[PDB]
């Protein structure tokens, strides 16, 4: 009978940076998916009120408009390889929308960052918030910058649509040999 707290995730006032995405577990609630890119994989969204899952994971972050296509199975790029990677067998939906009004200040919102450098690609659903200085040459950096692995987006309202901030919520639908706790209102 409990409603799933979708608005608590979507309508969160502050979203995390893509390198520090926030994951929340949704369980033991009825999932009304009726409380911009809306891509679903391995599932029909016209049957989302028509399905049951053991758990639903809700990840949230912020990227540019041009990086939204990278949030998908099998993608490649600085966001997909180094900041947020989906599994090739991902089951769930990816939702993004324009956020220039909320996350772009006139001088620039430098609180949002993305990972540019890493020594290995991100394994599915991995997260990395380290500040270790990336060594690009043959000489060890000894902890002194040798590039900082993070770069600020600098969101201003004057940027183009391909550089404006977008708020992304990645719903992951998961099944295991366990009772289903998240169901649409039509199978409550």
């Amino acid at each position, epitope marked *: 009978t409990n409603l799933c*707290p979708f608005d*608590e*995730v979507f309508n*969160a*006032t*502050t*979203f*995390a*940076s893509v*390198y*520090a*995405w*926030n*994951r*929340k*577990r949704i*369980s*033991n609630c009825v999932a009304d998916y009726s409380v911009f890119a809306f891509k679903c994989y391995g599932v029909s969204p016209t049957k989302l009120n028509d399905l049951c899952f053991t758990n639903v994971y809700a990840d*949230s*972050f912020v990227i540019r408009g041009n990086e939204v296509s990278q949030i998908a199975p099998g993608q490649t790029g600085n966001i997909a390889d180094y900041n947020y990677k989906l599994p090739d067998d991902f089951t769930g939906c990816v939702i993004a929308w324009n956020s220039n009004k909320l996350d772009s200040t006139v001088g620039g919102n430098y*609180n949002y960052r993305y990972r540019l450098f890493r*020594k*290995s690609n991100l*394994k*599915p*659903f*991995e*997260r*990395d*918030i*380290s*500040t*270790e200085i990336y060594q690009a040459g043959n000489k060890p950096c000894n*902890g002194v910058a040798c590039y900082f692995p993070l770069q600020s987006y600098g969101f201003r309202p004057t940027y183009g649509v391909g550089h404006q901030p977008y708020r992304v919520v990645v719903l992951s639908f998961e099944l295991l040999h366990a009772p289903a706790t998240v169901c649409g209102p039509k199978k409550s």
Partner: antibody
Amino acid sequence: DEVQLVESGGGLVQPRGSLRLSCSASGFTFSTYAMHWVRQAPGKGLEYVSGISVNGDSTNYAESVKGRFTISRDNSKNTLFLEMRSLKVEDTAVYYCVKDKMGYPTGEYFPHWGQGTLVTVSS
Amino acid sequence: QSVLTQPPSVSVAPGKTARITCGGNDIGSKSVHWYQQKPGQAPVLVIYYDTDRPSGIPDRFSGSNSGNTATLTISGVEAGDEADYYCQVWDGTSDHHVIFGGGTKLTVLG
């Protein structure tokens, strides 16, 4: 079996000194789990210290301990390490080695904790 | 920084139920985990993902999350439930990502 974390290497050290804590792990596949250290100053709450990836390729640190503490692991010998340098009087605490859940992302919650070793920094 | 606000101390009678709150900005947007630290003991996780108890934790321990307050409810309080209880969340905008609350000392009046 069952999970088991046994810390060692604590003691008393003067400020600006150095110390190395070791955590011996058993009851789980040490090579697959992310490891962390969480400390607790006496009569105070819990403060996250640092963490390490299953391979050691990724290390995270708290802002207070950045540039002074370095965390490493040896999956061959099933041991976690916390090398402490330039120790301050604020670093006095009981340091627990903790075990993450299986999978990613690492750092959500910590279901298994060690018994705890005490590090005291005093002039 | 994301700050989790916990009541410093809570006193309950044996057999009754105790409520320990955990406050934060949009705490419903984050998953809250609870830890129990008995005196002289290490922290032990009792609730994860705001509602679920790990194996071995009795059903008397319950979790909840709504709005800006997340509560941990212990029913039928026993003497062994006297401990320090900490709530924990994760934040990506804080530069300190692992957040532990101030903690609550649960005192049972046995």
